[PDB]
Swiss-Prot record, chain B:
MF terms (GO), sorted A to Z: 13-lipoxin reductase activity; 15-oxoprostaglandin 13-oxidase [NAD(P)+] activity; 2-alkenal reductase (NADPH) activity; leukotriene B4 12-hydroxy dehydrogenase activity
Protein role: NAD(P)H-dependent oxidoreductase involved in metabolic inactivation of pro- and anti-inflammatory eicosanoids: prostaglandins (PG), leukotrienes (LT) and lipoxins (LX). Catalyzes with high efficiency the reduction of the 13,14 double bond of 15-oxoPGs, including 15-oxo-PGE1, 15-oxo-PGE2, 15-oxo-PGF1-alpha and 15-oxo-PGF2-alpha. Catalyzes with lower efficiency the oxidation of the hydroxyl group at C12 of LTB4 and its derivatives, converting them into biologically less active 12-oxo-LTB4 metabolites.
Subunit structure: Monomer or homodimer.
Modified residues (Phosphoserine): S21
Reactions catalysed: 13,14-dihydro-15-oxo-prostaglandin E1 + NADP(+) = 15-oxoprostaglandin E1 + NADPH + H(+); 13,14-dihydro-15-oxo-prostaglandin E2 + NAD(+) = 15-oxoprostaglandin E2 + NADH + H(+); 13,14-dihydro-15-oxo-prostaglandin F1alpha + NADP(+) = 15-oxoprostaglandin F1alpha + NADPH + H(+); 13,14-dihydro-15-oxo-PGF2alpha + NADP(+) = 15-oxoprostaglandin F2alpha + NADPH + H(+)
Protein name per its UniProtKB record: Prostaglandin reductase 1
Residue positions where Phosphothreonine is found in the record: T19
Length: 333, 330
C-alpha cells in the first residue's frame, strides 16, 4: 500500500563538445518519476556503458537533452508480463539511474547467463562491441585462417575481441595500442605482436617488422594518419574493415590528409565500412552464443575498466576517449 | 640509309604541374638489328594520366614511358615481318628496336573504317579499364544509377556508354560546357560542369535525387569526398584513378569522412586494367569493337600532330584540354 518516490538522475549535454569533451559539457539533472501505468516497467540501472560513438552522435542531440547510451538494468516494478520484476534487461535508456519503459526497445539478456560472468559483459565482449568485432572480422574481413590481421585500438573493447577471435581462427595478429601496459596485456592474451603507436620510431617500420609479407586484413578502429600508413603495408587485394575512426572524432570538421590513391589502386585494396546492427535475428544470436562459449572456454579473455558511480559517468567517457581504459569502459551505478 | 630515332626524356621530375622545360628531346642513330629483333616506327603515341605518377620512378634523363601503335620497318624475327602493326610499350620514341617479347598484335579483324589509334583508347587499355571497372568492380546488372567523373575523357566516355547499353541511369561530370553538351548528345541522362556549378552537392542531388548505386572514380580528391554523402546504402565505389591529386601526391587534401563510409556501409575498391588477362581480356576487346561498330559506343580522339608536340599533348590532357582520348600522330 505505501508509495515511495523514485528519484531518477540523468546526465544531460549542457554544451556541445569543442575538441575534447570536458566535465562542463555535462549537467546532472534529477526528475521525480510518475507511477507505472498498465504495460509499463520501472528500471534501475546496474551497469552503464560509455562508447566512442557518443562523441559523434552527441552532435545530433539538442543541448539539454539526456546523453545517449545502452545500459544493463533490473526491473524493480512491473505491470508488463513479458518483463517480470527482478528480470535483467538491456536498454537504450541513456545516461540515467532509473527509467520507465513500456517494453519497446528492451532486450532480454542472453538466456542461460552464467552466475560467474558479471552482467556488464552484456555491454562489451558478450555485447555490441564483441558483435562488432565478430562480424567485422569474420564477415567484412572474412578471415578463414592463415591470414595476418592488423587491429588498431587493440586493447580496447572491440580490438581485444578482434585479436582473440583472429587467433582462435588460426590467424597471425598484430595489434596497436596507446600504452606499454596495453602492449604487455596484448602479448599476454595471445597477440603475435603489438606495439605502442605513440612511442614508435617509425610506424611504417614497426608495421613492416611485425609482418614483412604484409597484411591480408586491417580492422580499422582509428582511421586518420594511422590508416594512411597501413595502406602501404597491405597485401594485394587486401581488405580493410572500416569499423571506426576515433583519431578524428574531435576534429571531424578539419580532417587530416587522406589515403594515398597509389596504394589503393595498384594494390587493388578493398575498403569497407560497416555497423553492428546490420546483423540481426538468428545470425546475431548465434554470434552472441559463440562469444559466450568462447569466453567460457577461455578462448576470449576479458578485462573491464570499471568506473564506480553514476555521478562519475562523464569522467569515464572522457577518459575512455583519452585512452585510460584497458578493455570495456563500464560505469557501475 | 641509317635511321635516327628521337626520344622525349624526363629532364627533371615534375613539381606540381609539368611544364615544357621538364622534357628534353634526344636524337641517336640506331645500330643495326641483331637476330630476333625488329625495328619499329611509331604511328600513334599515347599520352596518359598515369605517366604523371609513374614518372617519379624514372631516373632523370630516361625516356618517358608509354604505349604506341607502331609498324615494323625492318625485321629479323619471324613472328613480326616487315609491314606488321603492333602495340608496343616502347615509350616516347619515333623509332624502337625490340626483341619481340613485349609486342602485342592488334585484334585480328581490325576494320579499316576504324583508325588504328583506337587501339590505344576505346578499343584499348582505357576502354578495357572502363569495361572491367564498370562491369566487374561496380558490377552493374541493369537499373542502377551510375556516376562517372572525367565523363568526357577516354575512360569516362566508355563507362557512360557501356552503362547506358546495360540499362543503367548515367550521370557524368566534366570541366567544360563543350564536354557537357557532348555527353548529353552521346546518351548520358544527366551531366554537369563541376567547375561552374554553384554547389557540387546540389548538382549531384539534382542529377539523381535518390542517390548513386556506383561511382566510377577517375578524379578522387575533394570531388570524391562529396560524392560519398550522395551514395545509397551499400553503394560501390570503383577507385579507377585520382587525377585530382596527381600534381599533389605528397600534399594530399582532407580525406573522406568515416561517417559516410561507416553509416552508409560503403565499399570502396581500387583496380588496375591489368588484372584481367587471357580469354576474358580478348573477349572484352571484341565486345568493345562490336559496340563501336554497332554505334552503341561513340568515340572522339583529341589528336595532336607531330612527335615534337608530345610533351604539350601530355600537359594539355592533364589540364583537361582533351575531349576523348589524347593521341599523338608521329
Ligand atoms: N561500426 C560499428 O558498428 C562500431 C561499433 C562499436 C564501435 N565502433 C568503433 O570501434 C572503435 C573501438 O570502440 P570501442 O568501444 O572498442 O572503444 P575502446 O577502443 O574501448 O576505447 C576507445 C580507445 O580508442 C583509443 N584512442 C583514443 N584516441 C585515439 C587516437 N587519437 N588515436 C588512436 N587511438 C585512440 C584509446 O586507446 P589507446 O590507448 O590504444 O589509444 C581508447 O581506449 C571506435 O572507433 C568505435 O567508434 C564501431
Ligand atoms: N586503374 C587503371 O587501370 C586505370 C587505367 C587507365 C586510367 N586510369 C585513370 O582513369 C582516369 C581517366 O584516364 P583517361 O586516360 O581516361 O584520361 P582522360 O579522362 O582522357 O584525361 C584526364 C582528364 O581528367 C580531367 N582532370 C584533370 N585534372 C582534373 C582535376 N583536378 N579535377 C577533375 N578532373 C580533372 C580532365 O578532364 P575535365 O575537363 O573533365 O577536367 C582531363 O581531360 C585517370 O585518373 C587515370 O589515371 C586508371
Amino acid at each position: 500500500s505505501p508509495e515511495f518516490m523514485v528519484k531518477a538522475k540523468s546526465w544531460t549535454l549542457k554544451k556541445h563538445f569543442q575538441g575534447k569533451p570536458t566535465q562542463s559539457d555535462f549537467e546532472l539533472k534529477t526528475v521525480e518519476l510518475p507511477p507505472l501505468k498498465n504495460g509499463e516497467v520501472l528500471l534501475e540501472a546496474l551497469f552503464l556503458s560509455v562508447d566512442p560513438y557518443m562523441r559523434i552522435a552527441s552532435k545530433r542531440l539538442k543541448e539539454g537533452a539526456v546523453m545517449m547510451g545502452q545500459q544493463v538494468a533490473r526491473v524493480v516494478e512491473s505491470k508488463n508480463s513479458a518483463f517480470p520484476a527482478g528480470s535483467i534487461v538491456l536498454a537504450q535508456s541513456g545516461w540515467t539511474t532509473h527509467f520507465i519503459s513500456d517494453g519497446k526497445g528492451l532486450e532480454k539478456l542472453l538466456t542461460e547467463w552464467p552466475d560467474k560472468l558479471p552482467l556488464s559483459l552484456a555491454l562489451g565482449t558478450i555485447g555490441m562491441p564483441g558483435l562488432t568485432a565478430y562480424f567485422g572480422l569474420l564477415e567484412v574481413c572474412g578471415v578463414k585462417g592463415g591470414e595476418t590481421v592488423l587491429v588498431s585500438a587493440a586493447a580496447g573493447a572491440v580490438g581485444s575481441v578482434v585479436g582473440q577471435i583472429a587467433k582462435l581462427k588460426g590467424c597471425k595478429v598484430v595489434g596497436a595500442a596507446g600504452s606499454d601496459e596495453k602492449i604487455a596485456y596484448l602479448k599476454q592474451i595471445g597477440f603475435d605482436a603489438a606495439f605502442n603507436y605513440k612511442t614508435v620510431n617509425s610506424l611504417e617500420e614497426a608495421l613492416k617488422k611485425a609482418s614483412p609479407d604484409g597484411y591480408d586484413c586491417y580492422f580499422d578502429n582509428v582511421g586518420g594518419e594511422f590508416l594512411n600508413t597501413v595502406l602501404s603495408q597491405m597485401k594485394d587485394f587486401g581488405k580493410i574493415a572500416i569499423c571506426g575512426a576515433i583519431s578524428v572524432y574531435n576534429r571531424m570538421d578539419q580532417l587530416p590528409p587522406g589515403p594515398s590513391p597509389e596504394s589503393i589502386i595498384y594494390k587493388q585494396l578493398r575498403i569497407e565500412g560497416f555497423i553492428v546492427y546490420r546483423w540481426q535475428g538468428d545470425v546475431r544470436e548465434k554470434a552472441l552464443r559463440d562469444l559466450m562459449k568462447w569466453v567460457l572456454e577461455g578462448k576470449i579473455q576479458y578485462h573491464e575498466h570499471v568506473t564506480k558511480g553514476f555521478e562519475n559517468m562523464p569522467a569515464a567517457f572522457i577518459e575512455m576517449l583519452n585512452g585510460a581504459n584497458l578493455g570495456k569502459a563500464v560505469v557501475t551505478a
